[PDB]
């Protein structure tokens, strides 16, 4: 019975990631005064199916690798970490209800940079290794503000429990007392997933240009399996929905609608701006987000003490 719960978690994750490609192409199409796919399925609904089948029957490279084993371990770690991020997400009840789900997700998302690093190792191209090192330094830069913003908010939560965060926002959204944290958090999750304006894997050649259609479709989909997750995590963190314990699907419809609107907000951001130069987003993290994030972390340390609003431990 628990295995049925695991499968109804992880198979709809891959289906939602598949149709997120269609939603991306359609929404980017209409924002660009054109259409997205509408030929392959009715309203393009068979486009991700045809695309996944097309990739799975292309010839892989199997190049001269510095490591064959890490060439294999990069998609496996990517998909495994991209699927295990979803297991403490309370919607309204989680698969694994753990006391430290927030810190769990922070640690497992910190583990995701090894996919980028091993994919840069496995290609013998030294320029792909350079781009992988730039991607890793980008991701570990924005993990700092992820950790500190998340700590500042959990100072208003009371615990590391993700299901407590629904109880925290029963009166007000947590974007109202923490919108500067929310906007730096949202841009930092945008910079975590190598997503535009923070993507540096299409132009000055990325870390996963060595992969062609066997592992690539897996990498990509693991990457989008992070993106929805991060928005769902943002939905739990700043836009907490109403939970009726006798009708849990009210919460499930409400957080699903908010997470869809936030993933579409990612799509609507990448269709609206140019990219950063690499040192410009390093300037954005280390000189603009990090002083504000430290200042607001001091503010959210001292603020529940000065208002007598320290949240419950349990």
């Amino acid at each position: 019975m628990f295995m049925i719960n695991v499968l109804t978690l992880i198979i709809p994750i891959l289906l939602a990631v598949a149709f997120l490609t269609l939603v991306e192409r359609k929404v980017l199409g209409y924002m660009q005064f054109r259409k997205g796919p509408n030929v392959v399925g009715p309203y393009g609904l068979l486009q991700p199916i045809a695309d996944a089948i097309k990739l799975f029957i292309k010839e892989p490279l199997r190049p001269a690798t510095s490591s064959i084993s890490m060439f294999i371990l990069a998609p496996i770690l990517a998909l495994t970490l991209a699927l295990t991020m979803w297991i403490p997400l309370p919607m309204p009840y989680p698969l694994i209800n753990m006391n430290l789900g927030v810190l769990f997700m922070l640690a497992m998302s910190s583990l995701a940079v090894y996919s980028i690093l091993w994919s840069g190792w496995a290609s013998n191209s030294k320029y792909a290794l350079i781009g992988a090192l730039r991607a890793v330094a980008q991701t570990i830069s924005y993990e700092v503000t992820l950790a500190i913003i998340l700590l500042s908010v959990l100072l208003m939560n009371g615990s590391f429990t993700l299901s407590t965060l629904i109880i925290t926002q029963e009166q007000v959204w947590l974007i109202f007392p923490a919108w500067p944290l929310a906007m730096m958090w949202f841009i930092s999750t945008l910079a975590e997933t190598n997503r535009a304006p923070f993507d540096l894997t299409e132009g000055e050649s990325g870390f996963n240009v060595e992969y062609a259609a066997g592992p690539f479709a897996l990498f990509f989909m693991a990457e989008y399996a992070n993106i929805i997750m991060m928005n769902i995590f943002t939905t739990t963190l700043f836009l907490g929905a109403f939970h009726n314990p006798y009708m849990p699907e009210l919460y499930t419809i409400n957080f699903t609608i908010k997470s869809l609107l936030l993933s579409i907000t990612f799509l609507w951001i990448r269709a609206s701006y140019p990219r950063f130069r690499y040192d410009q987003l390093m300037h954005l993290l280390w000189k603009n987000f990090l002083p504000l994030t430290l200042a607001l972390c001091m503010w959210h340390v001292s603020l529940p003490i000065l208002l007598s609003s320290i949240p419950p431990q349990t």
Partner: protein, 96 residues
């Protein structure tokens, strides 16, 4: 809003803790009879097992003091099946 709601949540937490406090003497009494039950059962089964061994004192304390020592996990669940052992030793850790 977070001020009013966290003050309300601290009041609710104090109410839950006082329900716990009011239940704690009954749980303490049941726990005491639980562990003395398991120790007396282990004592009788040791008395019916450890007769072949020469020089054996059944129920011999390993401590030189005569103070009550809180029973260890393998003292209580030492002669029971592996299902109850695994439950009592990793159930809370493995719970979901």
């Amino acid at each position: 809003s977070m001020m009013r709601w966290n003050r309300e949540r601290r009041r609710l937490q104090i109410e839950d803790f006082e329900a716990r406090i009011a239940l704690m003497p009954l749980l303490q009494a049941e726990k005491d009879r639980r562990v003395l039950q398991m120790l007396r059962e282990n004592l009788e089964e040791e008395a019916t097992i450890m007769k072949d061994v020469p020089g054996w004192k059944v129920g011999e304390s390993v401590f030189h003091t005569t103070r009550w020592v809180t029973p260890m996990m393998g003292e209580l669940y030492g002669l029971r099946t592996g299902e109850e052992i695994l439950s009592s030793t990793y159930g809370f850790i493995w719970y979901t």
